[PDB]
Design a protein around this ligand. Structure first.
Ligand code: NA
Ligand code: NA
Length: 331
DNA sequence: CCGACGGCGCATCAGC
DNA sequence: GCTGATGCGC
DNA sequence: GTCGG
């Protein structure tokens, strides 16, 4: 259950700025993660907060954050923020990172080499790599929320081609999209083939082939990176005659060994909080999970040998939990 | 006090 | 050349 | 930055 706007947005928002600043400008992921974490739980939090103490209570919340929360309650702002908002470099530094391929080093490098806008980018592509190129290119597309309708749509295309290419494959769209989301950010493609498993001799072709196909059929426009197992690229929906071009979008496809799929599936489907809790119970029944497998916890304190997973269920099976519907994997 | 905090594929870079 | 290390995104 | 050894 989550309410939150006229409630604690002021806070969650400030925090997010904070987080960004750490990541991008700071180069402190942990700190970004920390601020995000705080931002989340408080998001979920049913009350009109009234102080830090109140929030301290939150798990994630703490001293400094709560300190902030007081100024903010009191002032309606965070002074830190104003100097940050007013500091040149920082902002530009935060902006550029928006650009897919551009991280904090690049972004800071650029800003030092004077570059600090799309333009500068545009006027400097000899100074960008591919990934960065496509990202600059697709800048607005990417930040576009994707529509499930489309998702569905997109969902269908990717779905058949694979089917066209080979019949034995398996794919599945994961993410919020799997969780039943009205909208998404990208398309996570989870796939595998029978001929591809754990101790098996890999067919790059497999993945290859699925790409090409989707390529062949002008589904996937660009290509961020690709190798025997992972492919990250740009894809689009064929334009309806006299109907303006939709947006281009993120899509990644992942190939997995059949023995680890569901784990992968399960893993990749989320939620994140869900995974945590699950990791927990699964543990309670004496096992340790991950993206790949499920292991029987050692009678000692830890002990190898992964179990036979033929489904998501099975997973659920081992830990004595009802096979949850991806829909309610909210946690 | 102090370490962990997800890890990994894939591209490009520093080096030998 | 290639190895490993670093950036990036997921 | 927060949590927890
Ligand atoms: Na706390
Ligand atoms: Na970026």
């Amino acid at each position: 259950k989550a309410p939150q706007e006229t409630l604690n947005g002021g806070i969650t928002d400030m925090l997010t700025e904070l987080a960004n600043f750490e990541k991008n400008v700071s180069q402190a992921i942990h700190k970004y993660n920390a601020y995000r974490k705080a931002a989340s739980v408080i998001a979920k939090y049913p009350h009109k907060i009234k102080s830090g103490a109140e929030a301290k209570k939150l798990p994630g919340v703490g001293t400094k954050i709560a300190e902030k929360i007081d100024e903010f309650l009191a002032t309606g702002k965070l002074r830190k923020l104003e100097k940050i908002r007013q500091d040149d470099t920082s902002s530009s530094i935060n902006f550029l990172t928006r650009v897919s391929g551009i991280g904090p080093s690049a972004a800071r490098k650029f800003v030092d080499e004077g570059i600090k806008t799309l333009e500068d980018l545009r006027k400097n592509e000899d100074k960008l790599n591919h990934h960065q190129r496509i990202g600059l290119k697709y800048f607005g597309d990417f930040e576009k929320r994707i529509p499930r309708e489309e998702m569905l749509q997109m969902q269908d295309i990717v779905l058949n081609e694979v089917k066209k290419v080979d019949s034995e494959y398996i794919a599945t769209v994961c993410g919020s999209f799997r969780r039943g989301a009205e909208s998404s950010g990208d398309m996570d493609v989870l796939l595998t083939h029978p001929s591809f498993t754990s101790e098996s001799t890999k067919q790059p072709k497999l993945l290859h082939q699925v790409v090409e196909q989707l390529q062949k059929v002008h589904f996937i426009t660009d290509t961020l990176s690709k190798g025997e197992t992972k492919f990250m690229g740009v894809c689009q929906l064929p334009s309806k005659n006299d109907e303006k071009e939709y947006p281009h979008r993120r899509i990644d496809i992942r190939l997995i060994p059949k023995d680890q799929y569901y784990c992968g599936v399960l893993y990749f489907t989320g939620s994140d909080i869900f995974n945590k809790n699950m990791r927990a119970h699964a543990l309670e029944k004496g096992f340790t999970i991950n993206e790949y497998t499920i292991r029987p916890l050692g009678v000692t304190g830890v002990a190898g040998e992964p179990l036979p997973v033929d489904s998501e269920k099975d997973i659920f099976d081992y830990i004595q939990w009802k096979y949850r519907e991806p829909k309610d994997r909210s946690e």
